[PDB]
Structures are given as structure tokens and as C-alpha cells.
Amino acid sequence: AIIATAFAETVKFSGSKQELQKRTLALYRQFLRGAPTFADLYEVQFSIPTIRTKIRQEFERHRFVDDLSIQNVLYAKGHMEYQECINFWKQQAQFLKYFPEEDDIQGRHQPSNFVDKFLKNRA
Amino acid sequence: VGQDLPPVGGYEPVQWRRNLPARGFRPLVYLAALCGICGYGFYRALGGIQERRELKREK
Amino acid sequence: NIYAGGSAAAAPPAGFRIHRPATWEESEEGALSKATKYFLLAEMFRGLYVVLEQFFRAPYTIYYPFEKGPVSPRFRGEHALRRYPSGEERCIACKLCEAICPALAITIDAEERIDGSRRTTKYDIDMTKCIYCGYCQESCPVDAIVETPNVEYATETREELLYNKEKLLANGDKWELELQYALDADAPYR
Amino acid sequence: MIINIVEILIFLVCVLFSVAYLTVAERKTLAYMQRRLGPNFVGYYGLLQAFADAVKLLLKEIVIILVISPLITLITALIGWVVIPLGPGITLGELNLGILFSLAIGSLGVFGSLLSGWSSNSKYSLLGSIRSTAQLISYELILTSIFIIIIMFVSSLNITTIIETQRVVWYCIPLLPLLLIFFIASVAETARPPFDLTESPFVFFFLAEYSNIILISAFNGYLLLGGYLSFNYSYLFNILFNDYSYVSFLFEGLINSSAYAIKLVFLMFSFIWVRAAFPRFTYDNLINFCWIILLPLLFGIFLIIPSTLYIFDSFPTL
Amino acid sequence: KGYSVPPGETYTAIEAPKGEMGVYVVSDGSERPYKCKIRAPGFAHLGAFDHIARGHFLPDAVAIIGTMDLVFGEVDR
Amino acid sequence: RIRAFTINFGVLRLILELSGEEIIRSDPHVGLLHRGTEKLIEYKTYMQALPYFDRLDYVSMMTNEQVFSLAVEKLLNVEVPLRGKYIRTMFGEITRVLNHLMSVCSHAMDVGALTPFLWGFEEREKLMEFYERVSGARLHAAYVRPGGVSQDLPAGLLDDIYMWATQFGDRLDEIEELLTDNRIWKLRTVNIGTVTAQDALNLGLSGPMLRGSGIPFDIRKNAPY
Amino acid sequence: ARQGSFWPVTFGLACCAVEMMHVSAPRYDQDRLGIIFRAQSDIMIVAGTLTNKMAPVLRQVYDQMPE
Amino acid sequence: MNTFIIFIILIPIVGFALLAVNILLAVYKRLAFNAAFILVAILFLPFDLEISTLLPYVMSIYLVSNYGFTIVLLFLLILIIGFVYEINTNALKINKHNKPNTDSLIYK
Ligand SMILES: CCCCCCCCCCCCCCCCCC(=O)OC[C@H](COP(=O)(O)OCCN)OC(=O)CCCCCCCCCCCCCCCCC
Ligand SMILES: CCCCCCCCCCCC(=O)OC[C@H](COP(=O)(O)OCC[N+](C)(C)C)OC(=O)CCCCCCCCCCC
Ligand code: SF4
Ligand code: SF4
Ligand code: SF4
């Protein structure tokens, strides 16, 4: 395989943290710009701002990561996920892995205190 | 004892080469036959055209 | 000799340089002779004649619901728990067929009675996941489970497809004489 | 009045039957080409296959134009049946310009291939419909050009005039290469698989396909091979019959339709026989075969015929 | 239990009719293999596709399939 | 700018980017039949890991059985007997006959020739009888164990293998006759899929495709077994 | 008509797809009643291991069938 | 009322009937191209249309003896040079980029 696929980039490992910060910056710009495509493409029920606030809160999850090479693998995994999402490779049931809390409320009795955990012995 | 064995003389040799016996005639022979059957056909056809013209004269 | 290094006695063979492909003028047949094959489709009619030869011979086809194809005695189909003559269950809860199964279909519960002999309270094969390797027939020392050569047992639910002890003892009941015949004919080669 | 409505009843009912028994004949003979039983049977009960799957074919799903193209494809395939004669002077409508009609309807038959690709459109499916259309017109050329070089010997657009001219010798035996290239242009009009890239409401395309199969078989049978002609049969009758009677006209119309049906049936069998033995074409190979190699031969045959009529007296009189 | 195998690693390759099929097994010394990978032959045949099938027609992308011989019990596995 | 449109050309998904008729780049998906058979054999003994190899590459199953039961034998330092060696040789070779009898007559169907697929199946049925009379089930014979070969031949089998080998030469020449000389067959396939001898190596190709390009290499004669 | 002709859109995806093609082979034809496995009808046949990746594809093929 | 005209009135009725039984019994519910595809149909017309210029000669071939012959021969011989124009120029052939251009490896 000589030529690559469409949105791919050669996986290459930066030696500094600021260059990685620039790359994750451009990456969030790519997700956020392609967010109107995903609602048309995967036929979701909901609004484009919920896609955008999810992309934001999935980069909130790894804001305080110190180690450089763990940021490096995290960037490579994020670019692979962008690559799958911007094409039609993922389907609409694996795109909705990302939104389990939105689609339906499962029922009563979400346990909060120790008693509600304990009546069904920590579920 | 009881297991299967080949015969003591061995089997006869099978045919594993290509069997393509030639069965077409020579191509110039088919072409000579084609030219012959064509030319005889044109003989009959143009003879029929001349006979049909003489009948048209009569009518 | 000594070879060059980077180099062995596996030279190119004598004649691996293949000749130049011959031109139009180093051809044995005439252009008219070649054009007779070109326009009159010489080898098209040959392959037409082959399929016409196949039209006039007697076909290979067989009726399924009234004839079954040729089978071996060592063939494997639905399971059966055998019995002894003079009526005895023959599975001694020895637990070998469960330990060998490459898909973990067997599930056996074993309990011992006052008599000192050993049997199974619950025998079970999941036939959604049995794979028909016949290792379970090969492992049992007392020849208590076999592969009957039946294949015509397709069901409509999965709960029918979970074979307990009773169904497999019924299968050992029905298929017995052909089962014993197949095992006796198989028995020299085992 | 009653005299002609019973006549068109008999003809429509016979052609409607024969096109339906072809759908059984193809399954049977391709079964025995590959040593299978195929369909169970072929008898009077034998239509109940082609009837039963013709019923069940109307039970699937489809996903104003979609109404019209199967309709015009089937009626274009069905109106061309008048102009074939089945015996001497037996036509369902007699017209002096029958080849011009037959040719105009081979021209009308292309439209369903265009309008079928519009329905349930994609980009790639639309391109595929374009390719089927262009091969259909490309071989329609050589179809029409050989119609010309057949009626060069007749110099008449009437069809019974062709066959009565053909009485002395069939046109197939002088012009044997023409028979070969017509047979391949005839499985080219249709999508028969040496020539079937572009395949590999549906009941109308299904019926009209086989109707075009047997109708271009008819178009072979009257102009290249003998139409209703087998032999002279002047001597056998003078021993059997004593005088013209309805039994005698029955017996002659019977043997004429037998001689026509044997041509049509052997040619129809050869379509299914050339189906099985060969793989299909690249479309570039299809267009290249039509234009660059076969059609210069067609201009050459077209120039060599009037010159041969010229060298001798031999011009045909109307 | 089964039989037990000496510790070591091997790559044994034979000629399947599809091509060179090898298997690379690593033995713990126990009776279960520690690791064992197949070299499916059609894996590199389908991996070689878009170096071979460039500039060909689209029905020229179908005859090229059947001689790289993809059965797909191989290529995914 | 060239704008190429994308289409979704066993189980296999394959992306094609087309500029008209030409393929400019191609991208085969794979994985829709990945079922994890490489990880499962780490939890099964070798006697139990044996059927995981006629599960994969199921058309030529005894050869796939054989490659595992050779890697194991080399790792065991044991030695299959002589009768075992000839027996596994000839079953691997009727397995080769079966695999080419499917592959040739399936390339012939994909190209379009419809008779050899049907003819090939009848011949194949005789071979599946040869498997059915040796192991229990057809199409999944576990018959070559790692220690050797599972059990002995039947009583009258070798005679029927000769009886098949007599007629098979003629019934192979028959299917050969209408494809080898055929112009449509030859036309559709003389310039398609060409592989240079240096790039037959860098792509990791082997078998009939490395031997297509001119390089004399096969493991039967180079490093025999 | 539905009885005497039966056209299963086959989902042959692994090992069992060839055994299904052994029905289409000259021995076990089922040419006579009228099952032909060569290929929008109202039956499909799942034959072989259904992976994680394919369960939406299987349901999507099952959805666009007549009722 | 002759026997020709019931047929071409009666067939659209047969098609309408086979269509109305279908409406009774059924279930309901730009890319760039190559120049060869357009050119086959555009260029098909001047070769379909000389054929109909050839149609009046073939009916009246007896009358124009020895003279309409040569006029038709010259007509066709003027058409053959435009035919050999398009077959000299490789007009219908569609090309692709599969060749590596076969340039020898040059060093230093
Ligand atoms: C008298 C002086 C002159 C002497 C010469 C005789 C000339 C008069 C004869 C004219 C009749 C011509 C018949 C049609 C010519 C076919 C041309 C041909 O077969 O080859 C060209 C073409 C490939 O073009 P090319 O690139 O040059 O390929 C080279 C491969 N050799 O090949 C192709 O693309 C396709 C080849 C197959 C064509 C389709 C096959 C249809 C199958 C029907 C076969 C006949 C079936 C008959 C059935 C009834 C038989 C009882
Ligand atoms: C290009 C050709 C050059 C070669 C010429 C050699 C022909 C032999 C001469 C015999 C003449 C003869 O005697 O036949 C005469 C016949 C007609 O006979 P009639 O009705 O009885 O004449 C009436 C008798 N009157 C006049 C006294 C009243 O006319 C022909 O149709 C013969 C043509 C032979 C076929 C040539 C076609 C060649 C194939 C061309 C397609 C590519
Ligand atoms: S045949 Fe195999 S899978 Fe089935 S119960 Fe026996 S050992 Fe287990
Ligand atoms: S069938 Fe055999 S292995 Fe299984 S419990 Fe009975 S004796 Fe033991
Ligand atoms: S059920 Fe699965 S494992 Fe068994 S033969 Fe079929 S595809 Fe292979």
C-alpha cells in the first residue's frame, strides 16, 4: 500500500510538549469543524451543540496529564478516532457508544447513599 | 495385520500429461471449403436474380 | 571452485535465460491461416462442442428426501449415551468427556449412591456449541457416549437444542443396533 | 369482424405461450449442460413454474416514469410480431414496408434501458445504465447495416417477397460470414452473456427480454435462413391430395409453420447454448469489438456486394 | 491434562495451495501454548492489492481477486 | 483537481475511489470475520487447539491442520512414522487438488464462465467423500494430530483413490479445454495484475503468485518436509 | 407461488457457506422443488460465525426485507 | 376494420392490464464521466444516418444501373475516409495510468 487513506497522517512522535499542544489544538479544531458532518452522517436524534460539548468534555478528561509520551499515545488514539468518524467506517451504533447517558433514562433507583447501594448490595 | 496395502505388483500408470488430440482440419482447407460454398451460393443467387428479372419482363 | 561470496552453488539453471519472443515473421503459419482461426472463431466452437458433449450424458443428481448420500461408519451426527446389555447406563461419571471438549459443551453433575457405583445426576450437552470433533467419543473409557450417524434433527427452538440426560438416553435407545454395528466395524481401527 | 378477431386471438395466444415456455426451456437445457435435473418437469402442468414465479415476482418491493418504461418496453417488444410472416402471405397485418417497420421498432426498443436507470438513482447506477444504453445502440448499427445488405438482393421492403425470392437458395449459404456476425449481433441487441457486463416492473423487463430473444430469432429466420421454406414439396402433394380443400391448405400451412418453427427453435436453443460456454466482456472490449474490428469488415462486405452484382448483369428488379 | 512441550519458539512454514502459510508458536513449557500466530497467506495477498490494482478498469478489479485467492478465513482470523 | 467518488464494493467490504472507470486508489476493509481464534488457543491444550486450524482457511483444511501439527512436532522433538509421512503427504495433495478445484473454477465464475464451477463441484464431491470416509465429518477433518495421524486408513480406500485418479485426468482436461484457448478468457486476463519480480518480494507474496513472476521457490522442494 | 418457489437471500459468511453451495452443486441440487441459492425475497439464512463488527450489518440486511 | 389495427390497439391494453395487476399486487417504498462514453452516442448518429441515406438506393438499385452504382460507391468512399480518420486517431479507446513508464534506473 503506497498511498494512504484520505485524512490520515504519518504517526510521528514529538520531542516537546508545546509542539504536542499545537497538534492537539489543531486536532480539536478538526473535530469541532467536522461536528456538523456527524449529525447528517450518523443520523443522530439530537443537536450539533451536544456533539460539540461532548468533544469538549472528552478533551476535559485528559487535561491534567503530565507525562509526554502518554500525551503522545493519547493524541495518536484521538487522531485514529477522528479518522474513523469523519468517514463512514464507524456505523451509527458505534457512534452512539459515545452518548450512553443521553439516549434513555433506565428507570428509578439510581443509588446515591450507602443504604440505596446496600438494598441491592452495590448493584 | 488387516491394514490396507498397495498390490505387490503396483498399479498401472495413470494419465497425467495433456491429452489434446488434434481434431481440426487445416485452416486453409476450411477456407477453401468456405470460398467454395460461398461462390456456389452466389452462383445460385445471381442466377435467381436474372430469372426473376426475366419473369418481371413477362409480367 | 570457490564462489564469489554473496553467492552459492544455486546459480541460474542451464537455460533460464529465455529466448526473445519471436516476431510476426518468425511464425510458422501463414497470415491467411492465422486469420482463418481469427475470424472463424476456431477455439470458440471447440469449447462449444465440449459443453454439448456434456449435454448428452447421464447427470450426477440425487433425490434428497428419498435417498441419502454415501456415508462412512466413522461418521458423526447427534450424540447418544449408550447402555449395557441387561440394561445399565454405562456412564460412570468419570469426567473425561468434559475435560477434553474444545468448545466446553459438556456439563456434568456427578453424585454417588449408597451402592458405591458412580453415575451422573445431570448430563448435558449444549448443541449450539458442540463442534463435532468426536473427541468425547475418543476419551470415554467405557464407550458410553458415541456419535450416532443421524443428521436429520433440525429443530425450531434453542431450548429444544439443549440436550439433557433424558434426550441422549433416548437417542441411545433408538439408535442401538446400527450404533453397535458401526462401533463393531470401527473397532479394529481404534 | 369475427373473421379477424379469432385470427389475432390465435396468434397472440400462441406467441404469449411460446415466450413463457422459453423461460422453462432455458432452465432445463442449462440444467442438462451442467448435469443437474433443474426444473422438475415441462408439460401442461409445466407452465405452472413460469406462472408461479411470474406470480411471486409481483410480490417483492420497489423503491410516474417508473410506470411508463416497463410498459413501453413490453409494448415495443410485442408489436413487432405482426410483421413476421408465418407461411406464404400469412401476416397479421400485411404491409409493403415491413422491414422499415421492424427496423423502426428495433429503434424504439432502446428507451426502457434509458428510463430504467433514472428510477432509484445513484451516481454509479446511472453510469451503468449509460453503458448498457451505449452498447445497445452500438450493435443496433451493425444490425441495420446487414438488413441493408440482405435487401440488396431483394430490392423490396416486403417480407414475403424476400422469402419467395429466397425459394431458389437461402441467403445464409452465400453469405455465411454474415450469418455468423448476425448471430453475435443478435445476442448483442439482447444482454446475452458473452456480452453482459452491464447487468452483472421487473416482470415487464423479464417478459420483454425473452420476447426480444424470440423476436430477433424471427428476424434471423426470415431474412438469413429460410423463413417458412424447407424444400419444394411439389411432388409429395400430387400423390397425397387430389384437389384443393381445407384439409390440403391445413396440411401445407402446417408444414410451412413447422419449417419456420424449426429454424426459430434451433436458433433459440443456440442462444442458451452460447450462454453457458463463455465468460463475459469488459465494456471496452465490447465497444472495441463493435467499432474498430467488425464494422470495417462490414464496410468491406458492403462494398464487395454491389460490385459482385455489377460484374454480372444481376441487378434485382422490384 | 495433555502432553507437555519443551520451552522454545518455532516458525514452521509450509506451502498451502494459497501460498506460504506459516505458524509461529511459543511454548511456555506447560501444556497450553503461550502464544501462537498464523501467517495467513491471503493476508499479504490482499495487502498487496492497491499496489497491483492501480490503473485497471473496474471489471479489471474482479479477475485480479480470484488469483490472489481470498477465502477470508485467512485474511481476518 | 481530480474528484473521485467512493463506493462500497465470503464476507468482505472494500472501498473503491473511482475517477470514472479507473481505480486511482483502493482500500480493502477486513475484520468482519475476525472472531479471535489466535487468543483462544492460548487457553486450550494442543490436542484441543487442533480444530482451530480447520476453522481458518476452511477450503484446504488438512494443510492448515498440517502446519500446526508440524510446528508442534518440531517443538516436541518427536518424529512421525513413515506410513504417517506418506499418508499425510497424499492427503495434503488431495487437499491441494480440492483447493485449486475451487479456486480455478471460482475465478472462472467471477470472470463469468459458468460451466466449470458446476463441473468442479461434482469432482469436489468425490473428494469430500474421500474426507468423509477417513474422518467423521466432511469439510472439518482433524485427521492429522500433532503426534502423527489420528487413525488408520479404511480397508478399501486406496483402491478408490486410484479409481478416482484414473478418470480425473480426463475430467480435468475437459474443463481445461474450454478455458485455456478461449479468447474471452485470454483477453480478459493477459495484462491484468502484473507483479514485477522485485515487488513480488517486497509485498511478501508467495506461492503461485511469487511463482507467477518468474522466481523459482517453493517450500516442498526448497526446504522439504 | 410462495410455496413452490423459495429464494433465500443467503448470508453465507464463513465455513457453512460452502456447504450451502453444496446444495447448489450437482449432487444435492434441490433443483426440483425450486430452491436456488445462486445470487429481495422473504427469507434469509445466517450461516457462520456472526462477529462483533457485523451485527448491525446483519440487522440492516434483515430490515430491508418484505414483511 | 382490418386485422392489423386491433393488434396495435390491443397490446397497450395488455400492457395496461399486466400493469394494473402489478399495482394491485406489489409492495411500495454529479460524478464525472469519460469522453468515450459521450462520444459513442454523439458519433453514433452520423453512422446511423448514412444508413438511411443508403436506404433509398437499395430499393431502386435496378433503375440506376451503372451510374447510381458509381454515385453510391463514391458516397461510401467519401465516408470511409472519415471512418479511417477516427480509427487512425484512436478515438473510442479509453486510456488509464497503469504503466510505470519503464524508465531505467539511473545512478549518480
Ligand atoms: C474470404 C476472405 C477473408 C477471409 C476471412 C473471413 C472473413 C469473413 C468472416 C467474417 C466473420 C467474422 C466473425 C466475427 C469476427 C470476430 C473477431 C474475433 O474473433 O477476434 C477479435 C476480437 C479481439 O480483438 P483482438 O484484440 O485482435 O484479439 C486478439 C485475440 N486473438 O475478439 C473478441 O473481442 C471477441 C471474440 C469472440 C466474439 C464473441 C463470441 C460470440 C460467440 C458465438 C460463437 C458462434 C456460435 C455459433 C452457434 C451455432 C454453432 C453451431
Ligand atoms: C469476384 C468474382 C470473380 C471470379 C469469377 C469466377 C466465377 C466463375 C464464372 C461462372 C459464370 C457462370 O457461368 O454463371 C452464370 C451465373 C448465372 O447463371 P444463368 O442464370 O444461367 O445465366 C443466364 C445465361 N444466359 C446469360 C446465357 C441467358 O452467374 C453467376 O452468378 C456466377 C457467379 C459466380 C460467383 C462469383 C462470386 C464470387 C464471390 C464474391 C463475394 C466476395
Ligand atoms: S464431539 Fe467434540 S465438541 Fe462435541 S461433545 Fe464431543 S468433544 Fe465436545
Ligand atoms: S461419557 Fe465417558 S467421559 Fe463422560 S462421564 Fe461418561 S464415562 Fe466419563
Ligand atoms: S458453524 Fe462456524 S465453525 Fe462450523 S463450519 Fe460453519 S462457519 Fe465453520
Amino acid at D310: Y
Nearest CA in chain H to E51: H98
CA C47, C49, C51, C53 torsion-angle sign: negative
Alpha carbon distances (Å) from H100 to C76, E51, F195, H90, H104: 56, 12, 12, 22, 11
Give residue H7's domain range: 1-108
Chain position carrying cell 447418544: C80
By three-state DSSP, how is residue F92 classified?
Answer: helix
How many angstroms separate the CA of residue F138 from the nearest CA in chain C? 9
- Which value in Å is the resolution of this experimental model? 3.3
DSSP designation for A73? H
Contacts of E60 in chain D (CB under 8 A): 282
CA H3, H9, H13, H16 torsion-angle sign: positive
Judge whether A5 is closer than 8 Å to chain F, CB to CB. yes
Among residues C152, E13, G16, C151, the alpha carbon closest in space to that of F140 is found at G16
Strands E33-39 and F5-8: unpaired
Please indicate whether, in this complex, the C-beta atoms of B4 and F162 are within 8 angstroms of each other: no
Ligand nearest to the CA of D195: 1
Give residue A4's domain range: 1-123
Q: Are D87 and D224 in contact (CB under 8 A)?
A: no
CA F141–ligand 5 middle distance (angstroms): 13
Query: What is the Cα–Cα distance from F177 to D46, expressed in whole angstroms?
Result: 36
Chains that touch B (3 or more CB pairs under 8 A): C, D, F
Query: What is the Cα–Cα distance from F25 to D28, expressed in whole angstroms?
Result: 44
Alpha carbon distances (Å) from B37 to B31, C181, D183, D253, E17: 10, 71, 19, 31, 52
SS3 readout for H22-70? HHHCCEECCCCCCHHHHHHHHHHHHHHHHHHHHHHHHHCCCCCCCCHHH
Query: What is the Cα–Cα distance from D42 to C57, expressed in whole angstroms?
Result: 20
The residue to mutate among G13, G16, G54, having the most atoms of ligand 5 within 8 angstroms of its beta carbon, is G16
Ligand 5 within 6 A of CB of G18: no
Ligand 3 within 6 A of CB of C104: no
DSSP designation for E35? E
Strands G9-12 and G44-47: parallel
Q: Which three cell numbers stand for residue D238?
A: 400430387
**Strands laid side by side in the C162-163 sheet:** C106-112, C118-126, C162-163
SS3 readout for chain C? CCCCCCCCCCCCCCCCCCCCCCCCCCCCCCHHHHHHHHHCCCCHHHHHHHHHHHHCCCCCCCCCCCCCCCCCCCCCCCEEECCECCCECCCCCCCCHHHHCCCCCEEEEEEECCCCCEEEEEEEEECCCCCCCCHHHHHCCCCCEEECCCCCCCCCCCCCCEECHHHHHHHHHHCCHHHHHHHHHHCCCC
- The burial class, CB within 10 Å (0-12 / 13-18 / 19+), for B36 is exposed
CA angle D282, D283, D284 (to 5 degrees): 90
Q: Are D143 and D110 in contact (CB under 8 A)?
A: no
Buried b (16+ CB within 10 A) or exposed e, H33-48: eeebbeebeeebeebe
Chain position carrying cell 486450550: F44
* The ligand 5 atom nearest the CA atom of G49: 2
Query: What is the Cα–Cα distance from E47 to E56, expressed in whole angstroms?
Result: 17
Query: What is the Cα–Cα distance from D275 to D273, expressed in whole angstroms?
Result: 5
Structure determination method: cryo-EM
Q: Are C143 and C82 in contact (CB under 8 A)?
A: yes
Ligand nearest to the CA of D294: 1
By three-state DSSP, how is residue F7 classified?
Answer: strand
Ligand 2 within 6 A of CB of B40: no
Neighbours of C25 (CB within 10 A): 5
Please indicate whether, in this complex, the C-beta atoms of F173 and B3 are within 8 angstroms of each other: no
Torsions phi, psi for D250 (to 5 deg): -60, -45
Judge whether H93 is closer than 8 Å to chain E, CB to CB. no
Does the annotation place C133 within a ligand binding site? yes
* The ligand 5 atom nearest the CA atom of F139: 5
Which of G1, G26, G32 lies at the smallest CB-CB distance from D40? G32
- Give the residue ranges of DSSP H helices in chain D: 2-33, 47-56, 65-79, 98-108, 111-118, 123-154, 159-166, 176-189, 202-223, 234-240, 246-276, 283-288, 295-311
Torsions phi, psi for E25 (to 5 deg): -110, 140
Looking at the structure of chain A, the number of domains it has is 1
Q: Which three cell numbers stand for residue C44?
A: 470458440
* The ligand 5 atom nearest the CA atom of G48: 7
Strands D61-62 and E33-39: unpaired
Ligand nearest to the CA of G20: 5
Complete DSSP assignment for G2-63? -SS-B--EEEE-STHHHHHHTTSSSSS--TTTTB------S-EEEES---TTTHHHHHHHHH
Query: What is the Cα–Cα distance from A82 to H43, expressed in whole angstroms?
Result: 48
CA A78, A82, A83, A89 torsion-angle sign: positive
Strands H27-28 and D61-62: parallel
Among residues C103, B45, E46, the alpha carbon closest in space to that of F55 is found at C103
Q: How crowded is the C-beta side of H46, counted as CA atoms within 13 Å? A: 9
Query: What is the Cα–Cα distance from A62 to A50, expressed in whole angstroms?
Result: 19
Q: Give the containing element (helix H, strand E) for E20.
A: strand E19-27
DSSP designation for E76? -
Q: Are E19 and E45 in contact (CB under 8 A)?
A: yes
Query: What is the Cα–Cα distance from F51 to H79, expressed in whole angstroms?
Result: 71
Among residues D80, D135, D72, D136, the alpha carbon closest in space to that of D110 is found at D136
Query: What is the Cα–Cα distance from E45 to E26, expressed in whole angstroms?
Result: 25
Looking at the DSSP bridge assignments, the partners of residue F26 are F16
Pocket (CB within 6 angstroms of ligand 4) = C 91-97, 108, 139-140, 142, 144-145
* The ligand 3 atom nearest the CA atom of C125: 5
By three-state DSSP, how is residue B14 classified?
Answer: coil
Q: How crowded is the C-beta side of D269, counted as CA atoms within 13 Å? A: 12
Strands E19-27 and E8-16: antiparallel
Q: Which residues contact F221 (CB under 8 A, 6 or more apart)?
A: none
Strands C162-163 and C118-126: antiparallel
Alpha carbon dihedral B4, B8, B9, B12, in 10-degree steps, equals 0
Torsions phi, psi for F107 (to 5 deg): -60, -35
Query: What is the Cα–Cα distance from D170 to D179, expressed in whole angstroms?
Result: 11
Please indicate whether, in this complex, the C-beta atoms of B6 and F158 are within 8 angstroms of each other: yes
Torsions phi, psi for C111 (to 5 deg): -145, 145
Alpha carbon distances (Å) from F18 to D242, D285, F27, F194: 75, 20, 12, 20
Query: What is the Cα–Cα distance from D283 to D132, expressed in whole angstroms?
Result: 9
Query: What is the Cα–Cα distance from D154 to A118, expressed in whole angstroms?
Result: 103
Amino acid at G31: D
By three-state DSSP, how is residue A58 classified?
Answer: helix
Contacts of F31 in chain G (CB under 8 A): 51, 53
